[PDB]
Amino acid sequence: DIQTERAYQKQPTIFQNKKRVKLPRYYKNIGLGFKTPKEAIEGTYIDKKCPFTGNVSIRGRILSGVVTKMKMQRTIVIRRDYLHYIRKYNRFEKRHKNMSVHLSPCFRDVQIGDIVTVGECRPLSKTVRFNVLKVTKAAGTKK
Amino acid sequence: RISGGNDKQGFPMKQGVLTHGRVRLLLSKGHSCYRPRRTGERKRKSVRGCIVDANLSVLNLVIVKKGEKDIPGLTDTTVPRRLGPKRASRIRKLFNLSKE
Amino acid sequence: ARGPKKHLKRVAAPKHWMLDKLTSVFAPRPSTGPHKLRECLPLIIFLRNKLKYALTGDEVKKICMQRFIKIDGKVRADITYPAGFMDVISIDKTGENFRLIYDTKGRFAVHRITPEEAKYKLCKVRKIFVGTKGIPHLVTHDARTIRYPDPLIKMNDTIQIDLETGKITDFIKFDTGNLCMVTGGANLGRIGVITNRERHPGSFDVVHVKDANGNSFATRLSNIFVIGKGNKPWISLPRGKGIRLTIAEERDKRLAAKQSSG
Amino acid sequence: GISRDNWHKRRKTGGKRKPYHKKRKYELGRPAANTKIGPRRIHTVRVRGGNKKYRALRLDVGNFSWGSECCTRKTRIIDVVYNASNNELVRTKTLVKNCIVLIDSTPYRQWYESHYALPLGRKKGAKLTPEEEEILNKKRSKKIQKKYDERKKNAKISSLLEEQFQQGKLLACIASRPGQCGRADGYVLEGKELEFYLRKIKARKG
Amino acid sequence: KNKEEAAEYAKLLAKRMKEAKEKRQEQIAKRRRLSSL
RNA sequence: AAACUGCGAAUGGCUCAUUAAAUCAGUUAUGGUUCCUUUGGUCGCUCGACUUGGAUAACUGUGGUAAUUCUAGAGCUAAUACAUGCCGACGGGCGCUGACCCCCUUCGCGGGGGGGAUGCGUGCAUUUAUCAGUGGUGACUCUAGAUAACCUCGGGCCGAUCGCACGCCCGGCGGCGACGACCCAUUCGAACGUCUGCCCUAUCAACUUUCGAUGGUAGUCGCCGUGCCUACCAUGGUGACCACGGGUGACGGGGAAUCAGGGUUCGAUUCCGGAGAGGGAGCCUGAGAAACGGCUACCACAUCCAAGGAAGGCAGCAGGCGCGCAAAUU
């Protein structure tokens, strides 16, 4: 499956050339009461940006939003809808911000509609400052 | 020994610049022909070359080899060395003092 | 700006100094030191504004350079030295000794003490780390880095330190029931027993504090000190005892004192 | 100069910015070190905060490790073999981080032979004729030879290492950033790492 | 100063290692009491 | 006095041209960074000279150019400038090495349990790899420990520094400071990130993208996080919840005027933050500058000139011209 890229793919912590006569996996608890998924601990994949099996640290803000697009490699677009109070008219207007968010392949069962929970981490890329922390599937969607 | 002097527009020579005209040179601390004012200042001056032409004001000449003749302004009167040594080691070397 | 600021505008100065707005454009910018800009009381402001020995700032030069003012144990010849919380200002020729503890109104009170009291101060620990060769180091609120502290001293405790040596004597654990001077926010100067530290992982931990009169309030943990075991404080308190009697109580207690004293 | 500015770049949306300020200093770029194989030329920089940074421009020695059994020795780098960045930074013999380099083995071979007392590399028939390490394959007491034999139970080397050690040239991976630190340190490839990189050398080469 | 502080902490740390072992052995004596209760 | 050295000159002051998710504001992060200074740690932890070396300035002398805060040659002479380097603590530890050696068991081979010379290496910082998992977090690939090495000649530290008061001690021991110094911390910040918030415009409806647009992977660069930049990839990213483009007599805000309650208009202007020093650009020094009462070009303008050359930057305080309806004392 892995070693698709030009360079070799491995976790930088775990050393895999102890002398013999399966690769042991590095993982950590993310904190803030979030359970690390079994897939992250069990998995074969390597992703440096995963908040369970990568070099990224989650701190500051915890947001949530509906998944919109799962198009490009290892990241998705969430869409955070909110109601901005204009005071003159004592009314609200429906606004949205759609942030790019990195989606660790420990979360495999994700569909466009699932309410994803994200945590602020160091800038992964030009537009991405959030990794995914857990996934709740859209209300009803089981079949 | 020719130690080099001034162009007839006044611009000083530059030790090892290897031309006969004037060059505009980006000078710095630890250079000839340039005293900097601010720490790190790096002005662009005119300096005359090292090749001696008939396009000079004054040459600076330092006589190394003492010849036959006495020469009336130079070797007639001796001016004694204004200051003597200050550091203890230099005094110890001058007078040939021991280390006890 | 393209480098660090060296001035401080009088109107930009922290409110608790109680500098006016007609003497000058500038306030004294505190010299870099143990305490923060917004939390320190500079020496000049403790000499010419509060105690009123000096009149000008050149007077404070003529007092501090004579090596009389001994802030927590050591002589200071810097007119803008940041004296801050719990620090002991010893003016030796008058035989006077002051501890910088907050009045229940935000400002630092002038609180005189006994020289026997002046020998020690009380320091909130900021953090603990383990130094170069398993050596436990210990950083306080006035940055007094202490090597080899007692191992039962944790992050938010206090330590009664002797000024003449700079060694710990006794330490108050951050536990529920212990006295608390609040050293930040709206509740600045308030005194009361710690009731419930409420943990907020990733965010700031709020800490409820019940008063001596029962007027319970709350604060962010970072703004909270501990001054005593249970109800008994380890310092002498400034008059009012960190209660903050209300504007109505202040008014009728001014009226009562204004008539009764005469 | 050569700038490291976020503000010269188009926004997420695709709309392009205007500069509100001119190039700041703290957005330095500096030209690439582009360090080569050769006799040591390490220039120093002065960087943000009056700190030093060691521009390697030529670098040959490197403190490479042999993780399998913990030893790490200063060794001469001989070639750049493969780079996962560019195919040109192999043609142009440029040491960068995560370069694959041929290094000498003789410090590692001297160690292996001065710890396990087993001739490693070295074809059959080809003896050590000068009599240097024939002395350091024998000549113990009773219980010291016993200790070496108890240790010698765990001296099986991999087939790939055993083949590389024969040529006197191991494959190692630069873990340092020679342009920054001025060192060409790293680790010797073993196992599925070495299988992967030998397949990539074989893929590009033939 | 380095030597005296090291010894003076070593005696204080020793004292708190005896306090910690008495607390440890009390909670393992409570495990022997939860088998007895 | 001068002069070398050190420190500052990156603050203050001025102005508001540019700038419309920028700036700015509230709100967090820095477990992603840097930090002169102060403050407190640390500063015989390394097992390996009672003080060293060459200058250079001020000074004296010889000048040259029409001219500059221009500088040249010569003769001396200092350092907390510039280098260079010990003794001490210091005697030994601790890891490998391993000659040699004593004992117990087997009649003996063998297996264990003790001392063991010489040699190697050793501290904090550095860079890489490996092993175990003191104190700490909500979470570290944290801090600390162990191993193996490295340690740049454009070079980390480990004090060749200076003052007051003088003493004790059959020559040795010390007080009160000053300055210096690697690293940790602290203060002062800075820098880049989080969340949410901006005027008019659709006679601007699709825009961005193999001269990087959004993302992946590996480097380079950078103080560090990041398409910041390179190489190979993937085809993304944004928009009728108004993107994208254009305009603004647009620096943002705290605030100002008006005012039943809602509002409307203003904010160049003394506090905060940003920006710029005629326009762009590049850089030296330094902890901090892409500095302009620093330098280097180009463009525009303009000064002095023996016509060879040199010097300039008031959107600092005054003041002058010009521009204007419009604004003060060299």
Curated annotation (Swiss-Prot), chain A:
Omega-N-methylarginine carried by residues? 59
Sites bearing Citrulline, chain numbering: 20
GO terms of biological process kind? translation
Domain of life, source organism: Eukaryota
Return the InterPro entries for the record.
NA-bd_OB-fold, Ribosomal_uS17, Ribosomal_uS17_arc/euk, Ribosomal_uS17_CS, Ribosomal_uS17_N
Q: Which residues carry this modification: N6-acetyllysine?
A: 28, 35, 48
Q: Which family does it belong to?
A: Belongs to the universal ribosomal protein uS17 family.
Assembly and partners? Component of the small ribosomal subunit. Part of the small subunit (SSU) processome, composed of more than 70 proteins and the RNA chaperone small nucleolar RNA (snoRNA) U3.
Q: What does this protein do?
A: Component of the small ribosomal subunit. The ribosome is a large ribonucleoprotein complex responsible for the synthesis of proteins in the cell. Part of the small subunit (SSU) processome, first precursor of the small eukaryotic ribosomal subunit. During the assembly of the SSU processome in the nucleolus, many ribosome biogenesis factors, an RNA chaperone and ribosomal proteins associate with the nascent pre-rRNA and work in concert to generate RNA folding, modifications, rearrangements and cleavage as well as targeted degradation of pre-ribosomal RNA by the RNA exosome.
Quote the PANTHER family the UniProt record gives. Answer: 40S RIBOSOMAL PROTEIN S11 FAMILY MEMBER, SMALL RIBOSOMAL SUBUNIT PROTEIN US17
What is this protein identified as? Small ribosomal subunit protein uS17
UniProtKB/Swiss-Prot annotation, chain C:
Compartments in which it is found = Cytoplasm; Nucleus, Nucleolus
User: Is the keyword Signal in the record?
Assistant: no
Entry superkingdom:
Eukaryota
Q: Where is this cross-link: Glycyl lysine isopeptide (Lys-Gly) (interchain with G-Cter in SUMO2)?
A: 229
List keywords of the entry alphabetically.
Acetylation, Cytoplasm, Isopeptide bond, Nucleus, Ribonucleoprotein, Ribosomal protein, RNA-binding, rRNA-binding, Ubl conjugation
A Gene Ontology biological process term: translation
The principal localisation class reads cytoplasm
Residue numbers bearing the N6-acetyllysine modification: 232
Q: What is this protein called?
A: Small ribosomal subunit protein eS4
The gene name on file is RPS4X
UniProtKB/Swiss-Prot annotation, chain D:
Q: Where in the cell is it found?
A: Cytoplasm; Membrane; Nucleus, Nucleolus
Spell out which residues are annotated as carrying N6-acetyllysine.
Answer: 36, 127
List Phosphoserine occurrences by residue. Answer: 159
Molecular function (Gene Ontology), one example: structural constituent of ribosome
Question: Which parts of the sequence carry Phosphothreonine?
Answer: 129
Give the InterPro entries listed for this entry: Ribosomal_eS8, Ribosomal_eS8_CS, Ribosomal_protein_eS8_euk, Ribosomal_Se8/biogenesis_NSA2
Region entry Disordered: which residue ranges? 1-26
**Keyword Methyltransferase annotated:** no
Topologically, how does it sit relative to the membrane?
Lipid-anchor
Positions with biased composition (Basic residues)? 7-25
- Cross-link Glycyl lysine isopeptide (Lys-Gly) (interchain with G-Cter in SUMO2), residue numbers? 169, 192
Any one GO CC term of this protein is: ribonucleoprotein complex
Q: Where is the lipid attached (N-myristoyl glycine)?
A: 1
Q: Name one GO biological process term.
A: translation
Q: Which UniProt keywords apply?
A: Acetylation, Cytoplasm, Isopeptide bond, Lipoprotein, Membrane, Myristate, Nucleus, Phosphoprotein, Ribonucleoprotein, Ribosomal protein, Ubl conjugation
Is the keyword Lipid metabolism assigned to this protein? no
Pfam families named among the record's database cross-references: Ribosomal_S8e (PF01201)
Write out the function statement from the record.
Answer: Component of the small ribosomal subunit. The ribosome is a large ribonucleoprotein complex responsible for the synthesis of proteins in the cell. Part of the small subunit (SSU) processome, first precursor of the small eukaryotic ribosomal subunit. During the assembly of the SSU processome in the nucleolus, many ribosome biogenesis factors, an RNA chaperone and ribosomal proteins associate with the nascent pre-rRNA and work in concert to generate RNA folding, modifications, rearrangements and cleavage as well as targeted degradation of pre-ribosomal RNA by the RNA exosome.
| Family to which the UniProt record says this protein belongs | Belongs to the eukaryotic ribosomal protein eS8 family.
By what name is this protein known? Answer: Small ribosomal subunit protein eS8
Q: What's the source species for this entry?
A: Oryctolagus cuniculus (Rabbit)
From Swiss-Prot, chain E:
Residue ranges under compositional bias (Basic and acidic residues)?
Answer: 17-29
As for subcellular location, the record says: Cytoplasm; Nucleus, Nucleolus
Query: Could you describe the post-translational modifications of this protein?
Result: Ribosomal protein S6 is the major substrate of protein kinases in eukaryote ribosomes. The phosphorylation is stimulated by growth factors, tumor promoting agents, and mitogens. It is dephosphorylated at growth arrest. Phosphorylated at Ser-35 and Ser-36 by RPS6KA1 and RPS6KA3; phosphorylation at these sites facilitates the assembly of the pre-initiation complex.
Residues modified as Phosphoserine are: 35-36
Q: Which residues carry this modification: N6-acetyllysine?
A: 11
Q: Where is this region: Disordered?
A: 17-37
Q: Which domain of life is it from?
A: Eukaryota
Q: What does this protein do?
A: Component of the 40S small ribosomal subunit. Plays an important role in controlling cell growth and proliferation through the selective translation of particular classes of mRNA. Part of the small subunit (SSU) processome, first precursor of the small eukaryotic ribosomal subunit.
Subunit structure and binding partners: Component of the small ribosomal subunit. Part of the small subunit (SSU) processome, composed of more than 70 proteins and the RNA chaperone small nucleolar RNA (snoRNA) U3.
Give the family, as the similarity comment puts it. Belongs to the eukaryotic ribosomal protein eS6 family.
- Give the protein's recorded name: Small ribosomal subunit protein eS6
Query: Intact protein stretch covered?
Result: 201 to 237 of 249
